[PDB]
Design a protein around this nucleic acid. Structure first.
Lengths: 321, 64, 368, 78, 49, 49, 49, 68
RNA sequence: GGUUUCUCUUCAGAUCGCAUAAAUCUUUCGCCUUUUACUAAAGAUUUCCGUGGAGAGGAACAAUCUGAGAUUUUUUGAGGCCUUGCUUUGGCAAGGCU
């Protein structure tokens, strides 16, 4: 399956199951087992092949707003026929157009995150979790593990001044500075430059527009200028390169937003993946815990992240075979 | 054609197609290396403000 | 300035020379690194910042030594200044009891310490040029300006050796003969420092009397310099000195929502905002602030933890300020692990520094 | 091509032999697009006469031959 | 739509697989082919350093 | 400040100009104003150091 | 890295990652920050070649 | 064009003799030519006596004829 | 100077896999009458579901397509001509020449 198509399809499915519990007055739960122990396996031709299937979930798509994905969004093979999009019937590599990624990126807003950089994951990253397991201290929001390993005059009270506590975050961030015997420690990334990305609401605003959320410049000694129109008037047929080209399109800001779209949504071409091989809600537990949570979902976050760190740690480069 | 700014104040000596070499203060020049050199003395006479063309100036040097 | 101080120690005393070879390797490979061995056998490293020193210790633990080496707590280093003048016209004399030197230590002015440290004024100038510098903008007397002999613990350090002696101007040829040895005694005294072995700064050392025998010779051949050191130490003792703490300047690129949270972490770490402004042409804010260097240990880490890494701070050594506590109050109770309050801070700082390498106690009449 | 190679090697010492026989050998100050180029410390030997050491000599296409130094590889301008 | 039109307006010829690339390395290649090599920095550090 | 003390010829390149464009979406007049203010503050800092 | 991509013909930056040519210690790659300064000697052409 | 490229290839593979208009018959490797016949010759002995010049640049007005 | 697709062979050294399981063994544990079945950490290997590059064969559709291919400044007439030195006979080393 193609990853943004599959993700936007499941975001739509999420929207209609939200609608179905929010709109159905009385849901009826299903019997288990659906057949009795005396009920035999029925014949497909006698029961199912001769009858018509009922309706699937299948939201109506906008002819105006969901225009490129309007036809093939609910196919098992959406664009396998189209040679301009895929290689053919193997359904291996997809090569696409910007407005359908804009439409799918708009449609998949429920499952997708809103973060723009890894600076949100300051010490909540995989290198920090490897450091936390290898040195056997943990964040209260972070998962816990087994100990990996299982008099000093530096511990003299008359040579130690205590002003601020040297907590977990400090020893994680500077392990050679703070943790004696640092073994198998994975150093974290430092501060990337912060993404300050303007997000537009309406296409009425231009793609080169001063956002009032940006603080104003308030800019405040002469310039080395030549003689004004006394020498070097420009000749005939000299012009800016794209003077004939217009300034911006409505899909220009869509492509600007698609640049800061996440990893399955900032791509024009790629390979299709197995739907077992695509983890859809990985971002939902790869973020922090939200507010108002009970104990059980935070333990759920910690255990899911714990096995995610274990799977990331036990990755090996595969052999030839 | 581009040596006028280096000798816009200093004196230069250039040899014309006649073989006469004149040293004088180049005050102005044209785009085809036709340099008007004021107070030009040819090696002995005086040519005044002499516009020596680029094809005429086979050899030249900075005298002043 | 390499101001952060860390003690370091190998687990194995058999592998103690190997980490010493690695210490020469990291001191060779790093320009601003300072490696020292104290009287207690401890190895004190002075560095710029915590990330820099963690990189140095990582290089030592991985490449330059294969030995696992214990690391103590990071602290800072201080200087020594004074508040009031020396209340006694205090003296010492040579081991051959002929040359008697009397001198007092007093606080310096505001811009003089940073001017000498930035070499705005030099001893390489003319004495009249130095007097014009001290008389135009610092409004000194010309006699006090021509009385200036030497600057601080090193080349152009922030102590001013004023030699204005009308009782000893009757033998000013002998005074100029012993002037150089007085200069090395003053340089050695301000280099060592008798409080907790820190460098002496912002002190004007005014000489009052010099009862020196004519042509000391045998007692002038290496005895004036410890006599002048005793004079500097003894004049520093009753001059009510204070410890002198470096401060750190912090510049913060922050989103505008968590500004009160940054203020809360500043209240937690005793920091005060110089100025907060929005960035011109950017929606974020820049916060300029000042913090104690002791409280600056991972203020960036705590701020990124509180602001989820959105607020990013960078700090530098900026300047020095006095510690508000008193170092020489023997009546101050000090707990060895509880964080002391602000009047008890400097007392704890001098006790632990004196316990770190030498004798813990301090005597105000140890020399004189 | 050759003008680009002269502009690239217009700092080294070369000899420019004019059509009048004046051979100016010295360091190149700057090579223009045309043959009028400025040289530095050129010992301009005259036609069957002595040399004159000119610190600034600007050349018209009278300069015919150009004996270039060895500061030019085969793929330096290729 | 108008990217090969812009390419011909800049006088740049590119293949179809370069137009089928993702946006950031394609934009890096477009800016590299537009500005050539780095020469303003060379003039910056020769004429003024 | 250290270049003023070390007395070396300093030229300035303005990097990451795409953050004004793709990431900030500035008007060309406002981007020119920001760059001119950057040049003005660098010139003022050179004046006062 | 852009100057190395200009000069060295076979050395190109990958699409996913930004390479760091001067950062040659492994600690710089681990931390994701420049640590130790690096000299490079190269032949560079200007606009005039 | 193609004839100049063939003459440059013959000069690279052999000793080409170019007799310029300044009476300079140079036998050697002509490194490059031009559209204005700005010819650069690498290690060519020119007779004005075949004195060897390591790199000689000549103009098309000052050149007359070439040969392989 | 086709494409799609299928099969086989070969190299898989890239996150071969923007995914992730299991097994054995060497051990530490948790549990603990004992046997599998156990708990979670490490080391040592493996297996499975996938994967990339190359080549061959086959099939169906393009059936070509796709490439490659002047006078007027400074890059062409200021062109001719003579004597002495040398003729080294293509004219050369010096002078007055238009």
């Amino acid at each position: 399956v193609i990853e943004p198509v599959y993700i936007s399809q499941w975001g739509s499915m999420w929207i209609m199951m939200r609608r179905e519990k929010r709109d159905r007055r009385h849901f009826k739960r299903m019997r288990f087992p659906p057949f009795d122990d005396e009920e035999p396996p029925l014949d497909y031709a006698d029961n199912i092949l001769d009858v018509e299937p009922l309706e699937a979930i299948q939201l109506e798509l906008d002819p105006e707003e969901d225009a490129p994905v309007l036809d093939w969004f609910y196919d098992h093979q959406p664009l396998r026929d189209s040679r301009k999009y895929v290689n053919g019937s193997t359904y291996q590599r997809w090569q696409f157009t910007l407005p359908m990624m804009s439409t799918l990126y708009r449609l998949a807003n429920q499952l997708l995150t809103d973060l723009v950089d890894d600076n949100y994951f300051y010490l909540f990253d995989l290198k920090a979790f490897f450091t936390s397991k290898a040195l056997n201290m943990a964040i209260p929001g972070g998962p816990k593990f087994e100990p990996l390993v299982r008099w000093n005059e530096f511990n003299d009270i008359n040579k130690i001044i205590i002003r601020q506590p040297i907590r977990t975050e400090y020893k994680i961030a500077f392990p050679y500075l703070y943790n004696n015997l640092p073994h198998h420690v994975h150093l974290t990334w430092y501060h990337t430059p912060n993404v300050v990305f303007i997000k537009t609401e309406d296409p009425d605003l231009p793609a080169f527009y001063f956002d009032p959320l940006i603080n104003p410049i308030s800019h405040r000694s002469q310039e080395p200028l030549p003689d004004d129109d006394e020498e070097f008037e420009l000749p005939e047929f000299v012009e800016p390169f794209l003077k004939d080209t217009p300034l911006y399109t409505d899909n220009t800001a869509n492509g600007i937003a698609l640049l800061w779209a996440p990893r399955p949504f900032n791509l024009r071409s790629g390979r299709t993946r197995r739907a077992l091989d695509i983890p859809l809600v990985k971002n939902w537990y790869r973020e922090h815990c939200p507010a108002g949570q009970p104990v059980k979902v935070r333990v759920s976050y910690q255990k899911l992240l714990k096995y995610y760190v274990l799977n990331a740690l036990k990755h090996r480069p595969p052999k030839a075979q | 054609s581009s040596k006028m700014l280096q000798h816009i104040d200093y004196r230069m000596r250039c040899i014309l197609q006649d073989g006469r070499i004149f040293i004088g203060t180049f005050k102005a020049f044209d785009k085809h290396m036709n340099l008007i050199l004021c107070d030009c003395d040819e090696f002995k006479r005086v040519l005044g403000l002499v516009l020596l063309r680029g094809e005429n100036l086979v050899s030249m040097t900075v005298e002043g | 300035t390499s101001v952060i101080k860390i003690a370091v120690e190998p687990v194995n005393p058999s592998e103690l020379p190997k980490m010493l070879d690695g210490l020469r390797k990291v001191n060779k490979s790093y320009p601003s690194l300072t490696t020292k061995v104290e009287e207690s056998g401890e190895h004190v490293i002075l560095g710029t910042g915590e990330l820099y020193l963690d990189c140095v210790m990582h290089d030592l633990r991985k490449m330059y030594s294969e030995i696992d080496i214990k690391v103590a707590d990071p602290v800072v280093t201080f200087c020594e200044t004074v508040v009031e003048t020396s209340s006694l016209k205090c003296f010492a004399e040579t081991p051959n009891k002929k040359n008697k030197i009397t001198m007092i230590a007093e606080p310096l002015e505001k811009g003089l310490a940073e001017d000498i440290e930035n070499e705005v004024v030099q001893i390489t100038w003319n004495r009249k040029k130095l007097g014009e510098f001290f008389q135009t903008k610092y409004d000194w007397d010309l006699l006090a300006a021509r009385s200036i002999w030497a600057f601080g613990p090193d080349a152009t350090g922030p102590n001013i050796l004023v030699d204005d002696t009308l009782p000893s101007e009757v033998d000013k040829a002998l005074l100029g003969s012993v002037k150089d040895s007085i200069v090395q005694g003053f340089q050695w005294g301000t280099r060592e420092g008798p409080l907790c072995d820190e460098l002496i700064r912002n002190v004007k050392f005014k000489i009052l009397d010099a009862v020196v025998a004519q042509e000391p010779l045998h007692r002038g051949g290496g005895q004036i310099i410890p006599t002048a050191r005793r004079v500097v130490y003894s004049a520093f003792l009753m001059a009510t000195p204070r410890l002198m703490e470096p401060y750190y300047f912090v510049e913060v690129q922050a989103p505008a929502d968590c500004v009160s949270a940054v203020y809360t972490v500043l209240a937690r770490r005793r920091g005060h905002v110089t100025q907060d402004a929005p960035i011109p042409g950017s929606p974020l804010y820049t916060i300029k602030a000042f913090i104690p260097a002791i409280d600056s240990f991972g203020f960036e880490t705590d701020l990124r933890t509180h602001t989820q890494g959105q607020a990013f701070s960078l700090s530098v050594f900026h300047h020095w300020q006095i510690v508000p506590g008193d170092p020489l109050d023997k009546s101050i109770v000090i707990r060895p692990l509880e964080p002391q309050p602000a009047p008890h801070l400097a007392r704890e700082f001098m006790i632990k520094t004196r316990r770190r390498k030498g004798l813990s106690e301090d005597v105000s009449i140890s020399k004189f | 091509k050759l003008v680009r190679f002269l502009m690239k090697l217009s700092h080294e010492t070369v000899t420019i032999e004019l059509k009048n026989g004046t051979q100016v050998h010295g360091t190149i100050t700057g090579v223009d697009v045309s043959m009028n180029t400025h040289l530095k410390a050129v010992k301009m030997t005259l036609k069957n006469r002595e040399p004159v050491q000119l610190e600034t000599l600007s050349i018209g296409n009278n300069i015919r031959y150009f004996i270039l130094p060895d500061s030019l590889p085969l793929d330096t301008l290729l | 739509t108008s990217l090969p039109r812009t390419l011909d307006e800049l006088g740049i010829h590119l293949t179809k697989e370069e137009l089928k690339l993702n946006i950031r390395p394609l934009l890096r290649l477009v800016c590299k082919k537009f500005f050539g090599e780095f020469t303003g920095f060379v003039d910056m550090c020769v004429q003024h350093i | 400040k250290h270049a003023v003390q070390e007395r070396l010829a300093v030229t300035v390149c303005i990097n990451k100009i795409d953050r004004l464009i793709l990431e900030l979406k500035l008007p060309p007049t406002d981007a020119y104003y920001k760059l001119r203010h950057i040049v003005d503050e660098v010139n003022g800092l050179i004046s006062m150091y | 890295d852009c100057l190395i991509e200009q000069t060295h013909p076979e050395i190109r930056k990958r699409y996913d990652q930004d390479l760091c040519y001067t950062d040659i210690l492994f600690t710089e790659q681990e931390r994701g920050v420049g640590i130790k300064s690096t000299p490079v000697t190269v032949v560079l052409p200007d606009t005039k070649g | 064009g193609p004839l100049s490229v063939l003459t440059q290839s013959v000069k690279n593979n052999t000793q080409v003799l170019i007799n310029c208009r300044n009476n300079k018959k140079l036998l050697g490797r002509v490194k490059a030519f031009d559209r204005h016949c700005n010819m650069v010759l690498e290690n060519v002995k020119e007779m004005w006596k075949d004195r060897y010049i390591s790199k000689m640049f000549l103009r098309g007005d000052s050149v007359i004829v070439v040969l392989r």
